[PDB]
Every structure is written in structure tokens, then in C-alpha cells.
Amino acid sequence: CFEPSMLKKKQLTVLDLHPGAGKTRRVLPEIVREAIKKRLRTVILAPTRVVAAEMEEALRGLPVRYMTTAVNVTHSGTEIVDLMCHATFTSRLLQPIRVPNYNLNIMDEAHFTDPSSIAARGYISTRVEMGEAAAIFMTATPPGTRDAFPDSNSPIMDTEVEVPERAWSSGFDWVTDHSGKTVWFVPSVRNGNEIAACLTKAGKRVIQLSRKTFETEFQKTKNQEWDFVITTDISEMGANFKADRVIDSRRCLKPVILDGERVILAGPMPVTHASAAQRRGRIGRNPNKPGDEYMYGGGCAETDEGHAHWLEARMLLDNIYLQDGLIASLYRPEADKVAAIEGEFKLRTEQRKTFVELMKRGDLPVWLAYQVASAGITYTDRRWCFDGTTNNTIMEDSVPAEVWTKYGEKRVLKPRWMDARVCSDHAALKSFKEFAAGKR
Ligand SMILES: Nc1ncnc2c1ncn2[C@@H]1O[C@H](COP(=O)(O)OP(=O)(O)NP(=O)(O)O)[C@@H](O)[C@H]1O
Numbered sequence: 001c002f003e004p005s006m007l008k009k010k011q012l013t014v015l016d017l018h019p020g021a022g023k024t025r026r027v028l029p030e031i032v033r034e035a036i037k038k039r040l041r042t043v044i045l046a047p048t049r050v051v052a053a054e055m056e057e058a059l060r061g062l063p064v065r066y067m068t069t070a071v072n073v074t075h076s077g078t079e080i081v082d083l084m085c086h087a088t089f090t091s092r093l094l095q096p097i098r099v100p101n102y103n104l105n106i107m108d109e110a111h112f113t114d115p116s117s118i119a120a121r122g123y124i125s126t127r128v129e130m131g132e133a134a135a136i137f138m139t140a141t142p143p144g145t146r147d148a149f150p151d152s153n154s155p156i157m158d159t160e161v162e163v164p165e166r167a168w169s170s171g172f173d174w175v176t177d178h179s180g181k182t183v184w185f186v187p188s189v190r191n192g193n194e195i196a197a198c199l200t201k202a203g204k205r206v207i208q209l210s211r212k213t214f215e216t217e218f219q220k221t222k223n224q225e226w227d228f229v230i231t232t233d234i235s236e237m238g239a240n241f242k243a244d245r246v247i248d249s250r251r252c253l254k255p256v257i258l259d260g261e262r263v264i265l266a267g268p269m270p271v272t273h274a275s276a277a278q279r280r281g282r283i284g285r286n287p288n289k290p291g292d293e294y295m296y297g298g299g300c301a302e303t304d305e306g307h308a309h310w311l312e313a314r315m316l317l318d319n320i321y322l323q324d325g326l327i328a329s330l331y332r333p334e335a336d337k338v339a340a341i342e343g344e345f346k347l348r349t350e351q352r353k354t355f356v357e358l359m360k361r362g363d364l365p366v367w368l369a370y371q372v373a374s375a376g377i378t379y380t381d382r383r384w385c386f387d388g389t390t391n392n393t394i395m396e397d398s399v400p401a402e403v404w405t406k407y408g409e410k411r412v413l414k415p416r417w418m419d420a421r422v423c424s425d426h427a428a429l430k431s432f433k434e435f436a437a438g439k440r
């Protein structure tokens, strides 16, 4: 549980109650009330805008400044408690914007493996180690967890079973014979597309979720009748469903940097124990409803090792001012996950601005944004999208993708640096084509 002693400077506490135990809805407001009593300048970090909106409900009445348009409230001026998304925190730290030296740093769903969340944990844990601050990381699955089957509010039926990853017609009757509501974790948007299409043809009502569609589509899980939610790993971060079954492929894609020169999406390959526990954790949450089902289609492995997100986190952290020339280290339990030289990605003022703009407005992956900024290219200079090797040709429906450049010339998309995440699904490619065309 929480104790006021956890609010003392130099304290970092991992509140690791099992999934559903009440960390976000019960323990968080307790902490916040105590922080306010103690006049502690406090930041609450929500993984997503959806979760931020839910927190406003659990925190209602309390004087919290919601630094998100996801929440519709008139703020007073009392507020010494701020709430923002993980990514917003890290983004503000990278920009010349002033962010308070928060006395207390509360990160909910602190297992989130997005680069900006990893970087935020590194920054926060370094501030605490410096003796400057306290921190509470709230997650059922702290870094390095080896338990894929933690406690739950009610008993879960765990079953190892072959899970389809492609359209099927026979041999998987248990999937469609089910009468309730299923959350199905897939390794990618495209894989989810195929499974969704198959289910829809079988007469099921399907909602699909991924990182860029999560806000709009998640509301459909409330506003619309559904049989299946097909989701990527984004739903591991405190997403609440009224479901009675989870189907878990136990698979994910792993961005991997090859030879420091390109990023591939490796796999699909096993999820971590933490990811598996969070996926399973979507059900068994109602103590009055035993027998929720968890079907899983493979084992776990430590696939965060060598995963690009921890290298990308270093790129972010190398560019956040801490004190003089010091550079914050990653949070200790996840600091092995990357082989990097601390400070090696530090950029000077102008290149850092370019780096930030390429990630924000550019919506480029961190790794790719870094290659461009560190090469001395300015944000609006898109010549690099076209002057790569033939091997870097991006394909769309089996034919090289083409755009009209801002000069009006039709050119094949051949980026100088290839990051597979810019074309891993239709939406990603659409966005990158707009970028290469100078439209953003
Ligand atoms: N909208 C809701 N209204 C009432 N009860 C709810 C609601 N949503 C969830 N609950 C219940 O409240 C409990 C506390 O939820 P929550 O505080 O999110 O747990 P948690 O420990 O943070 N879960 P996790 O992030 O998966 O480790 C859940 O286990 C549900 O049983």
C-alpha cells in the first residue's frame, strides 16, 4: 500500500500490486491528497489521453491541473498538482519550455515501453538519486518481471492453445463459438486487419485498436455493440474493457537497429512476461465474476533486450538538460536493454530543435528523426527521402511508392535512412508520403 513516508525526497517506490488491485482508482487519489496536504509540487503522468480522461473522474474535486485537451474542466489557480501524458512530459523536457522541478513524480502504468516513457523514468529516477525528488512508479509489472500469471481479483482460466495468426476456416471453433466479449492481442496492425476481416466474415462485430487510432476507436468499445476487440500492445497500458475473454497471440514485433544504419521490424516473436501479464490482466478484474478466460498461443521471452525503444530512449535522454553537462541514466532495472555510450546522442541547440520538430510535427520515429537531425539537415529539407540506395525503396502494393515532391516532380520513395516503422501499415505509409511531399 501507500505510506506518506514514500513522499520523502530520495524515495523511489514501485507500487506493484497485481492487475486490478486498485492502483489507478484507489491508491492514486490517496497519494494525491497526501501530496497536497504536504504542499508537494506534484506531476501525475498518464500513459494515454484516454487514461488521463479517466483519472479526472477518480481525482474529481481535487485541485489538479490537466495539461491535456482530453479533459474538459475550468482550472482554478490553487493547483500545485499537474497531470499530463508520459510523452508530454518528455517532450516538454526536450523543448526550451520550463517544467517545474517536481517534488513528487507519479507515473501510472510505469511499464509502458514507449521511448518517451522509458526516458521519463530515466530522468525521474536520476532526479530522485540526486536527492531532488520523490517518485512513485505504479505498475503491476515492473521491469524484469518473470511472472506472466500474477494474482487477479477473480480466478482466471488459463489455457495454452494454438491461436490463429492468419485467416482460418476450420480447426479453431473455440474462437467463434464463444458467446461473450473477447479482447485479442495481435503483433501488428496488418495482422489484426486479417484476423478482423476473417471474424467479420464469420458474422462477428469487430473493433480494431492501435496506437494512432486508440482515442477514436476506444470510445467505440463503449458506444457500440461488439464481439471482438482486435488490438496491438497499446491496450497493455491501463485499457479497461468489459470483456470475459482474452485471446493472446503472445507475439509482438521488435524494432531492431541493424548495423546502426537501418531499423527493421523483427518477428513476430514472443512477448515479455510483463506484456503477457498485462494482456491477461485485461480480464479477471471483477471479483464477482470468476472464470474469465485467457487463451495464449506461445511462450514469453526477454524481447526487450536489444529492442530499439531503449536506444531511442537514450537519444531522448541525452538531449534533456539535467544539470550542467550531466546526463540522466536509464532507470536501473532497464538500463541493460541497450548497448550505448551515455551522451553519444547529445545534440547542439539547433540540431536538437530539428530533432524535436521531426518527432513532433514530423511524426517520425525517434531513431529516424535522430539520423536526419544529426546529419545537419533542416526540418523542411526532404531531399533525403529520395536519395537512398535502391535497397531502401519503399513499396506499396508490390510497386515502388511514389509522391510528388514539393518541387512538383514525381519521385520514388527511397529514403537515405530506412526505418520500417514508416511503412509498416497503410496509415504509416500515407503519413510518410505526406512528409516526403513536404505537406507537413
Ligand atoms: N469504471 C469503473 N467503475 C467501477 N469500478 C471499476 C471501473 N473500472 C474498473 N473498475 C474496478 O476497479 C478496480 C480498480 O481498478 P484499477 O485501479 O484500474 O486497478 P489497477 O491496479 O490500477 N489495474 P492494472 O493497471 O491492470 O494493474 C478494477 O480492478 C475493477 O475491478
Ligand SMILES: [Mn+2]
Binding pocket: 023, 024, 108, 109, 238
Ligand atoms: Mn492501473
